[PDB]
Structures are given as C-alpha cells and as structure tokens.
C-alpha cells in the first residue's frame, strides 16, 4: 500500500497546478526496503564462502558443488510452507533463516563424509558404495530431526502478546530442517554420492597445486594432538569434572549478574521533537522557539539531518496553543557514516542544546523498533478513583507522586504527559437583575456562543464542493477580558444593554487535559528505569509509593506494561518443557537411559559462552538473545549426538568400552570441526555490521558465535568422558 499510494495517487499531478508540488518530509520505506535488500545480500555472503571453505576441506575442484545445489533449493521450501501457513515475511523470518541456512548443510556434510570414507581408504566404486553409505547414514540421519525440532515445537505453543514474536522464530525455521531430512533421504545419497564421483585412487595431499599443499599434514597433526589430548584427559578424570562444576556454578552467577532488556531500538533515520511552554502562552509563544530550533538543526547539525518538518497546535502530549511536534528526517544509511551520526549521539546532543533553552521544555526522542505499538520506551501508571472523589485531591496525589519521583533509585526521568492547572476565566451572571433589566437567558446564551464559540450555521457550495459557513465576532474585540464588556444584548423592548451591567467574571484554575479511564477520571505519568535495568524492579519500586496518596484512589497498569504485568518473559515456564521433550526424545536413538542422560549433560557447556559474549560486547539480554540461546544449544546438542552413536554402535562390534569412544573420535573428527566453522564463517558480516538494521543484527550476531565457541573446541574435550562414565553401566 505504500508503493500503491506513493505514485498511483500522484497521477493527479497533470491535473495539479504548477504552483504546488509534492515532497516527503516523513517516510518509512527504507527501513522496510533496504532491510530486505541487505538481508538478501547477507544471504548471498552467507552462501558465497561456504562453497570455498569445503572446497578447501575435501580438496576437490570440480566435484565440489554436489552438496551445495540442494542448499539454494531447500530455502524456497521455507517460503512455500510460510505461504501455506499464511504468515508474512518480516525481519523475523529473515533473521531466523540467516542462521538456519548454515545448520541445514550438515546432512550434506555427513553424506560427503560418507563418500570420503569409502573414497580414501577404499577403492570401491560409488555405485556399490551407495548401499554401504545408506546402510549407516539412514540410522543416524533420521534421529536428529526429532531432537532438533523439539526446541521450537514447544516454543510455538506459547502465545499472548509475546507469542506472535515467538512465531517466525518458531516452526517456520525448522520446517526447512523437516524438509531437508526428506531431501536427504530422497535426493542426495543416490545421485550426488554416485554420478559426480569418479575413481582416481584418491590418496593425495602432497602437492595440491599453487598455494594449497600444506594443509592435510597439519590437519593430521591436529587429529593426533586431539588423540593424545583425550588420552591425557582420561588419566585422572576427577579435576576435569571439578573444573566442570565450577563453570556450572559460574553459569547461574553470570545469569544472575546480567540484566535484561526488551526489543532494542535502531536509528531509523527519524526523530521526534515535542515542545512545551508554561500555560496561557499563545501559538506565537510556541512559534518563537520552533524557528530557532529549526535554524539550529539546519546549521549546527547539518552533517546529520536532511530535513525538518515542524507543526504546531497538536502534539503527543495533548493539543492546543501549548503544544507542538517536529518530525526530523536524517541522512540515508550510506550518507551518515560513523558512530557519531547515530540517533543516540544526536539525541543527547539535542538534549544538551535544549538545556540552554529557558522558557521551553523541549524534549526530543526516538521511536522504538516496533512502530505499531508505543511512541517511545517505558511504562505508564493510570491513577483511578474508586469512590468518585473530586479533581483537586487526585491532582494533589499526582503532585505528591511526582514529588516522590526523582528520589526513587530504580527510576529516572519519569514525566507527565498532561499539564498543570491552567488559569481559566470563570464567568458568572446575575440573572435576577438581568431579568429586572428585561433580558432573557437563552438569548444571552445564543449571543455568547455566536460571539466566542464560533458557531456553524449551515452548508454552502463552492467549486462543486460542499463546505461550511461559520459565524463569529471579531478578534480585536475578544482578546482582552474588558473587551468582553464591549458586547451588547437586546432587551425585551428593542434597545441594547452592555455585558458588565449584569455579568462579571473571575480567575480560577483548571486542568486543560481531562482523561477518563474505565468510566472514572484518571491521570497518568510515564517513565523508564535506569539504563540497563529491567522493568520488574522498576515496577516493584513504584508500588510502595502508592501508600503515599489521599486514600480513596488507586493505581492501574496499561500500555505495553500491561502485558508485562500479565505475562512477560516466561523463562521459569520456558526452558523446562523444551528440556524435558528433548530429554525424553533423544533416548529414541540409543535405547538406554544412562547414555542419553549423560549426553544430555553437554547442554550446560554451550550456553555459558553466549552469556559472557554479551558482556564482552556490551549488550543486555533480549528476546533475540532468548532465541539465540535456543539455537546454539540445539547446535551444541546436534554436534554432540552424532559422534556418541558411532561409539555405541562400534562398542558392540569389535572394540572395548573405553576404546570405542576414542576410536569414534579418531574416525569422525573431520565433520565436527568442518561444519562448525563452515557455519560461523558466514555469520561474521552479521556478527559485525553497521547500517540499516544494525542493532537487531547485533542482537543476534554476538551471541551465536559465543554459544558455539564453548561447543566445538571445548565440548569435544568433555563429551567422551561423559560417555565413558563409571555409572554408565
């Protein structure tokens, strides 16, 4: 609809006169267009180098593409099932698929490992080796899907306000896995293993051509180093778990130490700036400051803003002559480089400039990432009155609450959106002496309403259009209170009497913005906690101040804090059913209890690194990180399970109980070191990124590598000792 109203209604431009044109002072098309055009480029940079890194791995220059032709095809099945489920594409499914694209290649890795294990040590043709491959890969490939899907399948059942954001990180991601296992059963191991695989007696690794012949012997040295390191770690086996329990104690300590946030903001190229004046000020008294801030923004900050567009008469904090707001459009994303061109530096510089203004309470702010709810970040507090008590006592309650506002240590910069008591003029009439002079009352009401209420009489036609005709006096006879004495009304016998002979007036006070809530009147303030602190302690720190009020009134929570009071982050209820479903489901492969219970204990090893990776980066917890933990523990679990089943199936074949584990590490060390770096070498342009949508990309980039660096080089030292435990009888 944006592209269907931005030029299809511009077809009236030939019908438009030459004295008018069209500009775009406010827009939102780049954050929806350039975001998609950037995420398709980062998908290209994702599957651009994953061909060349495995080309470095398997040393094949022509028979190389065969695990990477299915990969640009299976992502279309995600869009197919996404159209079948009827959910629109967003930043969410793109941010899911940019990490899902690297975890769906692992079956293509394991089938070319099944090819290479009969290509290296065996001279068998791939036609006779396809049956040997599928005899051992069908019992190992169909089991990972039910343990990988069960991290999102219980996560999809949770709804609420924070459930539609759990969707598109739900089953829409792992539907690509559920179709990739099907195309792994039906597509790769019959043709990609056989037809593009000649026999040249492959035992090379000495010359390799050009700048390539010094990798395979170093890889053999690293495999022998791992084989002697596991023999070194099986010596004592007591301090290697005594240092495991201390990092289990460190996980809960880091989890308590880190605070959380909720949906962090971006730059978006837009800024809002509202104005404020003391009451009674006219529209010119607000016009005297918007031109000054316009000249300031156009001259002193010319390296950041493209255009400004202010209005007056209307604001987010009410309306009238005491109001006004300004939209600010900055440079495009290729035109404002550097961190000083961000919205936060511009916001704090604007506030530092607005500190110099004396009689105006100008406030600038930036909208959050989500636009369809909330103008800014924070919380509100409605103040209901149950007994229906008057306006002045609840105004004094608001005054006492705003006095006990800046003293709270858990909150900062909490402000009202209303106003103070405006000095109004209350008129009074002496209808007894007015009737003694011989005037009525309804004619007096009619005259004062036509004189100052700016009445509307009927319709009239102009240029084929129906418009309205009003009726009012003149402005220069109504700007002053004694000018209100300049009016005359007709009595019963034709003559006129002035206004001051019967009617007078005085000066009282009254609020200009009266707000009701659930039938009763209610005022409110809005704020935010300290930078970094959550909203739970900020909620708990204000429910103790509500004992300091005139008793008879109560409090209420609404807005985006309403769902936070109802059901926010359900991390107690989360990570429990999802843990139990994989703990019951992973025993379907090994048909035991002690071995699945032992290999389940790798899930603490991967979660710890993503906690302190955020502290090393400098970011707080979010729902993006809350699904980043799920995908990295899924990656750690699937990187742990595919090596223990080989040891279990080869213990009963020809080996012992302690030797089969190190034999499985001796025979299957290649793909576990392959696919982990093959995944994370594409996430680096998303791990470090500055531009359109850089904050939400950073909200997932710094967690996924930290969760796996403690999972592919570290957890391989701990998984076989977990397998060969003495309780595993």
């Amino acid at each position: 609809t944006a592209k269907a109203i931005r030029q299809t209604i511009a077809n009236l431009e030939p019908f438009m006169p030459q004295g008018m044109k069209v500009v775009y002072p406010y827009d939102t098309t780049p954050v929806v267009s350039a975001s998609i055009h950037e995420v398709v480029k980062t998908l290209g940079e994702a599957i651009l180098l994953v061909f060349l890194v495995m080309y470095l791995f398997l040393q094949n220059f022509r028979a190389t593409l065969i695990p990477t032709i299915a990969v640009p095809v299976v992502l279309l099945g995600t869009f197919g099932v996404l159209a079948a489920f009827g959910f629109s594409i967003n930043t969410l499914t793109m941010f899911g698929m940019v990490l899902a694209i690297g975890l769906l290649v692992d079956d293509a890795i394991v089938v070319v490992e099944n090819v290479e294990r009969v290509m290296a040590e065996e001279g068998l043709s791939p036609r006779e080796a396809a049956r040997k491959s599928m005899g051992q890969i069908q019992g190992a490939l169909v089991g990972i899907a039910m343990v990988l899907s069960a991290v999102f399948l219980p996560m999809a059942f949770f709804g609420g306000s924070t459930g539609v954001i759990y969707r598109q990180f739900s089953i829409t991601i792992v539907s690509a896995m559920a179709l990739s296992v099907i195309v792994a059963l039906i597509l790769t191991p019959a043709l990609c293993a056989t037809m593009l695989k000649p026999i040249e007696k492959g035992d090379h690794g000495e010359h390799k051509g050009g700048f390539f012949g010094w990798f395979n012997r170093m890889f053999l040295s690293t495999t022998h180093g791992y084989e002697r390191g596991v023999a070194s770690i099986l010596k004592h086996r007591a301090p290697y778990l005594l240092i495991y329990v201390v990092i289990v104690a460190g996980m809960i300590w880091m989890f308590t130490r880190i605070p959380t946030a909720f949906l962090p903001d971006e730059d978006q190229g837009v800024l809002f700036a509202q104005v404020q004046t003391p009451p009674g000020s006219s529209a010119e008294r607000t016009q005297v400051v918007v031109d000054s801030m316009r000249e300031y923004l156009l001259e002193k900050e010319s390296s950041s803003v493209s255009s400004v567009f202010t209005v007056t008469g209307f604001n987010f904090a009410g309306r009238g002559q005491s109001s006004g707001m300004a939209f600010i459009m900055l440079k495009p994303w290729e035109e404002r480089p550097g961190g000083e061109n961000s919205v936060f530096e511009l916001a704090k510089r604007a506030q530092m400039h607005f500190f110099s203004f004396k009689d105006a309470m100008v406030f600038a702010f930036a909208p959050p990432s989500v636009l369809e709810l909330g103008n800014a970040t924070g919380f509100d507090l409605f103040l209901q009155d149950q007994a229906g008590v008057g306006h002045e006592v609840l105004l004094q309650a608001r005054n006492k609450f705003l006095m006990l506002a800046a003293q709270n240590p858990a909150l900062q910069r909490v402000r009202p959106n209303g106003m103070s008591d405006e000095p109004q003029y209350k008129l009074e009439i002496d209808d007894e002496k007015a009737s003694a002079l011989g005037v009525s009352l309804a004619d007096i009401n009619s005259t004062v309403s036509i004189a100052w209420g700016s009445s509307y009489v009927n319709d009239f036609i102009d240029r084929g259009r129906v418009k309205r005709v009003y009726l009012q006096g003149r402005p220069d006879a109504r700007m002053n209170p004694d000018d209100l004495s300049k009016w005359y009304v007709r009595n019963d016998k034709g003559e006129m009497v002035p206004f001051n002979a019967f009617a007078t007036g005085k000066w009282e006070y009254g609020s200009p913005k009266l707000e009701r809530y659930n039938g009763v009147p209610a005022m409110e303030i809005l704020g935010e906690p300290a930078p970094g602190l959550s909203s739970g302690d900020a909620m708990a720190a204000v429910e103790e101040i509500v004992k300091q009020l005139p008793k008879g009134v109560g409090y209420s929570w609404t807005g985006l804090s309403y769902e936070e009071r109802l059901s926010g982050s359900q991390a107690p209820a989360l990570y429990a059913l999802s843990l139990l479903v994989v703990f019951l489901c992973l025993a379907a492969l090994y048909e035991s209890w002690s071995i699945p219970f032992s290999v389940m204990l790798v899930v603490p090893l991967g979660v710890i690194g993503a906690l302190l990776a955020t502290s090393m980066r400098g970011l707080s917890n979010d729902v993006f990180f809350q699904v980043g933990l799920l995908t990295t523990i899924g990656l750690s679990a699937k990187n742990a399970i595919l090596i223990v089943e080989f040891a279990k199936e080869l213990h009963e074949q020809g080996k012992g109980i302690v030797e089969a584990a190190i034999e499985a590490c001796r025979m299957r060390l290649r793909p576990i070191v392959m696919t982990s770096l093959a995944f994370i070498l594409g996430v680096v342009p998303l791990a470090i990124s500055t531009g359109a949508g850089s904050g939400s990309q950073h909200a997932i980039g710094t967690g996924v590598i930290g969760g796996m660096v403690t999972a592919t080089v570290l957890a391989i030292f701990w998984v076989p000792l977990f397998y060969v435990a003495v309780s595993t009888l």
Binding site: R319, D443, V469
Partner: protein, 201 residues
C-alpha cells in the same frame, strides 16, 4: 515400502524441482513487510466541538457515551481523554488476536445509543470511528517556490482534491490533515451591531 531412490535418479531430481517451483511461485504472491501484527486492536472514536472547555466536553459528550461502551467481546480497557479545543478520543483496546471488523460494528451499534443523547450542535459535526492503531506512515503536500500560495489554499487543495481518491485505497485507516479546508467565515462587529440595534442571533 522404502529404498526406491537408487534406481531412478531424475525421479529424485523432479521432487526437488517441483518444490523449487512451489517456492518460486510463492514469492510473487506473498506480501513483504518488516514486522507482523504485534499490537492489539485499538479502535478509536473522536468528535469535534467548537469553542468549549475541557470540563464542558467532559460533562457533555463523553460521560453520556462511556456509559454505553459496554457489552463488547474481548474488551481490555478504554483509554479516553479530552482537550481544551473541544476534542476527545475514547480509544478502546481489545485482546490480542481478534478481527477488528466486529470490534468496529459493536462499538458502532453501542454508539447508536448515544447519538440522540448528544446536543444538537455536536451531532452536525460528525462522529468518527477509525481503526487506527498507533502511528503514521507518510506525509505529503507542499507549496512550490513560485509564491502566491499560502497554507490555506494548500490545505484546501489537499482536502478537496487529493485525499478523496486516496482514502478509499488499500491500507488507509486514518487521515490527520494539518489545517482545515475552505470555509465561509463571517466576522461581526459589536459596535456596528449596537449601532444597528441588532443581536448576532
């Protein structure tokens, strides 16, 4: 049965080709945005009332209309307010995951219980029921540098020409035009009215 993929290679090609075609046909028909529906429905109702205080607009035309705003499914709360230029919003929010058409028509049929209860001046202005959620999308409309055109005729050409083929397209829910259209303003003089022995009425 199983193990039916070794013998027929291009039968294993065409099963990938048909899901590639099914994914290729899905891009041109699926709509593109950046964020789905997160906010609950936020059905707004606003009126205008010329030349009255906030206390008058609170004790006249919101107290008689918030007593009939009831009997509605999935009602969360009623965020209402009033201003000094005779404006008010009684925006009712609903539960998450609800089609807003019944939320429109229920508020409409409950607003029918108040339209004769309103005074005669505010009924000739026009009640407004909108499905606006929280925010705007774009603003347009500006004067050229040729001069001889103020803000008034600019607002009149915005209202009388542009928004009439614009407000009936897809995605349009609310319009917030800055400045009003043309009107016939008749300004009176109290000294001349006293001289000619006439009231304004």
């Amino acid at each position: 049965m199983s193990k039916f993929f070794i013998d027929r290679p291009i039968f294993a090609w065409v099963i990938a080709l048909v899901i590639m075609l099914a994914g290729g046909l899905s891009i041109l028909s699926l709509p593109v945005n950046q964020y789905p529906a997160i906010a609950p429905p936020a059905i707004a109702v606003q009126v205008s009332y010329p030349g009255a205080s906030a206390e008058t607009v609170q004790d006249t035309v919101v107290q008689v209309i918030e007593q009939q705003m009831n009997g509605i499914d999935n009602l969360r709360y009623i965020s209402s307010e009033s201003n000094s230029d005779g404006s008010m919003t009684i925006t009712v929010t609903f539960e998450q995951g609800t089609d807003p058409d019944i939320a429109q028509v229920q508020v409409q049929n409950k607003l029918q219980l108040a339209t004769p209860l309103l005074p005669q001046e505010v009924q000739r202005q026009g009640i407004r029921v909108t499905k606006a959620v929280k925010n705007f999308l774009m603003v347009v409309g500006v004067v050229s540098t040729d001069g001889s055109m103020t803000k008034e005729d600019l607002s009149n050409y915005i209202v009388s020409n542009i928004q009439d083929p614009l407000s009936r397209t897809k995605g349009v829910g609310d319009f917030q035009v800055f400045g009003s259209q043309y009107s016939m303003r008749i300004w009176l003089d109290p000294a001349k009215l006293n001289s000619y022995q006439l009231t304004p009425g």
